[PDB]
Amino acid sequence: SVSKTEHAEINIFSVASGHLYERMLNIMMASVMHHTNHTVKFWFIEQFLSPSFKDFIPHMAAEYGFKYEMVTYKWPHWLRQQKEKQREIWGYKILFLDVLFPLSLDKVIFVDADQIVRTDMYDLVEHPLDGAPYGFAPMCDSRVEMEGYRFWKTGYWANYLKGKPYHISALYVVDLQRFRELAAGDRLRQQYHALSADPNSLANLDQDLPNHMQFTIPIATLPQEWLWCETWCSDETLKDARTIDLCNNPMTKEPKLDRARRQVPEWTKYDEEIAELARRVREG
Numbered sequence: 001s002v003s004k005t006e007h008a009e010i011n012i013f014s015v016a017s018g019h020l021y022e023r024m025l026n027i028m029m030a031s032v033m034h035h036t037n038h039t040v041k042f043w044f045i046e047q048f049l050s051p052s053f054k055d056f057i058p059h060m061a062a063e064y065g066f067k068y069e070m071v072t073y074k075w076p077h078w079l080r081q082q083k084e085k086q087r088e089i090w091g092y093k094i095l096f097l098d099v100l101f102p103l104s105l106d107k108v109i110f111v112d113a114d115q116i117v118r119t120d121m122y123d124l125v126e127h128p129l130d131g132a133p134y135g136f137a138p139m140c141d142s143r144v145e146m147e148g149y150r151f152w153k154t155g156y157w158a159n160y161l162k163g164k165p166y167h168i169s170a171l172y173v174v175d176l177q178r179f180r181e182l183a184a185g186d187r188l189r190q191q192y193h194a195l196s197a198d199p200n201s202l203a204n205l206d207q208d209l210p211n212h213m214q215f216t217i218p219i220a221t222l223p224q225e226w227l228w229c230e231t232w233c234s235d236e237t238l239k240d241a242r243t244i245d246l247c248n249n250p251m252t253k254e255p256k257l258d259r260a261r262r263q264v265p266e267w268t269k270y271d272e273e274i275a276e277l278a279r280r281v282r283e284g
């Protein structure tokens, strides 16, 4: 309750790089606030954001009734760098969970910038982790026609996992008290540093690292309904989805905004609402 009183009942962080992902990030935030009456604070990885986004966030905060904070954490010099901006952004999602946030914050949830929330996120804050420092949803198996693209069901990953789930990194709850209690941050940084000496390792950096460490840094497998993506999940399970991720479909390669408008009926409503707020602020 000290964390809830000082920060908020729900604390969410995200990362966005590019005007398209910033546009989706405002939509994600509006979707969270339309589905909760609990207090919310959004945390941003500051250095990737545009000046316009950072100028607009106080307007979003006053319109939607949320608190916010910008975190600017410098990549430690000892730790192997990522030349590709995509991989550096993935590093910011998983390698610094213990240092991005204050010691007074007990829990934080990563929600992808391209996500659409359809649930009260305080349900994830209250979800029992049974001692795990973090919880991730598994990758769906329900869309049977995409089995050939489930790389984790054969080869390296099938042997490595021994039947454990291969989790998606679009959404994850981190019990920061337990993550700190376990030294998970230091351990994830040292494993990443050693593994990344091979440039063929950790292809999906943010996702592969926690899945690789799940025998020593436990993952609480969240209910499947916490994360639904069309690529892997059946149409039939969309009605149960608490959140939607617009993940890439390797079979169709359909553009991001087309996936958003086609799959999510309320997407244009949030987009037009944020554009209406922008026009209202611009005149004044």
Ligand SMILES: O=c1ccn([C@@H]2O[C@H](COP(=O)(O)OP(=O)(O)O)[C@@H](O)[C@H]2O)c(=O)[nH]1
Pocket (backbone or CB within 6 Å): 015, 016, 017, 018, 021, 086, 089, 113, 114, 246, 247, 248, 249
């Ligand atoms: O903030 C971001 C996140 C992703 N991308 C790019 O968008 C593409 C698809 O990545 P995305 O995260 O959308 O894929 P998903 O994980 O949703 O399947 C890649 O070229 C990324 O470099 C980007 O420009 N900005």
Ligand SMILES: *[C@@H]1O[C@H](CO)[C@@H](O)[C@H](O)[C@H]1NC(C)=O
Pocket (backbone or CB within 6 Å): 034, 035, 036, 037, 120
């Ligand atoms: C918030 O409270 C109002 C009170 O009238 C209620 O109608 C609404 O459904 C609540 N929303 C959530 C997400 O709990």
Ligand SMILES: [Ca+2]
Pocket (backbone or CB within 6 Å): 112, 113, 114, 115, 170, 245, 246, 247
């Ligand atoms: Ca995504």
